[PDB]
Ligand binder design. Structure first.
Ligand SMILES: Oc1ccc(C(c2ccc(O)cc2)[C@H]2[C@H]3CCC[C@@H]2CCC3)cc1
Ligand SMILES: Oc1ccc(C(c2ccc(O)cc2)[C@H]2[C@H]3CCC[C@@H]2CCC3)cc1
Lengths: 234, 10, 239, 9
């Protein structure tokens, strides 16, 4: 490949430059949302974010070296996790709130608009406050998001992928070493970061069943792309 | 057929 | 606190001695399976394992320092994850097979006897081959299993307390690094292996989520009866 | 809860 040659700083700069933009929701629409109204906005947003995620993935060092099938498998497995960690990262400077979009900042009470959504909201808000607690840096965030993309479906098939994962681990440690953290503080933070990924996986599966519940109940029509990503989880 | 296939190639 | 003043070797020693036994099933090899009888066999086994897991959790350094309410929450959240990683660990030296019990060694083609169960089997088997690939050590395993108990439900909780749980988690992190340092690993290799081990827990959480949905499906189906403890652990996940 | 009782003794 070619991603294993990059330095830690070159890895950070590559990931930072590959970052997808912050998309907007449709303006308005007015006072409180109904179940169909809220899920409508979220579905539209998620579908558009998905398009940028796919182009972001191709700009993740080492990802393009993978076969077409492998790239598909990874994205099918991780897409909701990736959307979620993005959402959580955006909401960091907004405690008690979730920034789906700059014009769409929702609180816990607004999670009640849809049945069984407030539980997912709580898990997301908790993850956000955890990031805020750890004072998560942007350079650390882009490493974590890439790790999710490469790891989530890797056990569902690999030597090259794990080599890239190790490369990102080197990069994480590098950042912490630059921040002035001691050796002990380095493996402790690294561990703390990676353990959160287990919770992010948990939220995704809770969220996946929610979306599947929405399809069944036909609350709002899902896009063809979203359905294909959703159908991949049986 | 998959939409994801197209977006990845494009 | 107790677990706070504990060396790395003493941490390992405590965890190793706290290990639950390996239970047997009521399996009679002189018959094929159905769908219900095997789940009956696996339920009977899991239910008895739960009792030992609960008494094992008490011996995990720092767990008893937590309130009763918090202890309940952590176990309700991680019980299947812990059952699964134990299963995966027992199955390391048996490629293509899952060792639910010394007298119960199943492969992928027997998992089909229960509908949709072969999916979970594949993930468990893949996890086992992953452990074998990494050459997972017994000292590393008990560290990982204790991490799951403390980490899986910590995000679902004055509240810190919290900080005590994370402090214990950090102590287990030091322990893993200490182990790898002994095995001759460089600084780079230690961080890498540490990362690789903790990323497994992500897939373990995944299998647990899928497994939990499978059990909930079994319950409503009235297929076969779950035990009264297994029902409470299941209802705790709001499925 | 059975989990309560088992965690007690
Ligand atoms: O069709 C949909 C697919 C996913 C979504 C979601 C979403 C996530 C991130 C994001 O940035 C935008 C939306 C959801 C989000 C997490 C779980 C699933 C949804 C419902 C509650 C909030 C909403 C609709
Ligand atoms: O009631 C049950 C609860 C859990 C189980 C399981 C189990 C896990 C570990 C173990 O050591 C013994 C059994 C299962 C195991 C993983 C997922 C759920 C079950 C079905 C397929 C294998 C089976 C029945």
């Amino acid at each position: 490949s070619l991603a294993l040659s990059l330095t830690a700083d070159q890895m950070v700069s590559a990931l930072l430059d590959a970052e997808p933009p912050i998309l907007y929701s449709e303006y308005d629409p007015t006072r409180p949302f109904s179940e169909a109204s809220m899920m409508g906005l979220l579905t539209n947003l998620a579908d558009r974010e998905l398009v940028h995620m796919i182009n972001w993935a191709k700009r993740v060092p080492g990802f393009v070296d993978l076969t077409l099938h492998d790239q598909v498998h990874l994205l099918e497995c991780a897409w909701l996790e990736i959307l979620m960690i993005g959402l959580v990262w955006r909401s960091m400077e907004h405690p008690g709130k979730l920034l789906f979009a700059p014009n769409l900042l929702l609180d816990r009470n607004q999670g009640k608009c849809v049945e069984g959504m407030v539980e997912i909201f709580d898990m997301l808000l908790a993850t956000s406050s955890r990031f805020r607690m750890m004072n998560l840096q942007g350079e650390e965030f882009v490493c974590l998001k890439s790790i999710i993309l490469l790891n989530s479906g890797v056990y569902t098939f690999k030597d090259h992928i794990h080599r890239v994962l190790d490369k990102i681990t080197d990069t994480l440690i590098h950042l912490m070493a630059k921040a002035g953290l001691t050796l002990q503080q380095q493996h402790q933070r690294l561990a703390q970061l990676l353990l959160i990924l287990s919770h992010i996986r948990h939220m995704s599966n809770k969220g996946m069943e929610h979306l599947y519940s929405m399809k069944c109940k036909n609350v709002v029509p899902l896009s063809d792309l979203l359905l294909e990503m959703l159908d991949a989880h049986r | 057929h998959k939409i994801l296939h197209r977006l990845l190639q494009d």
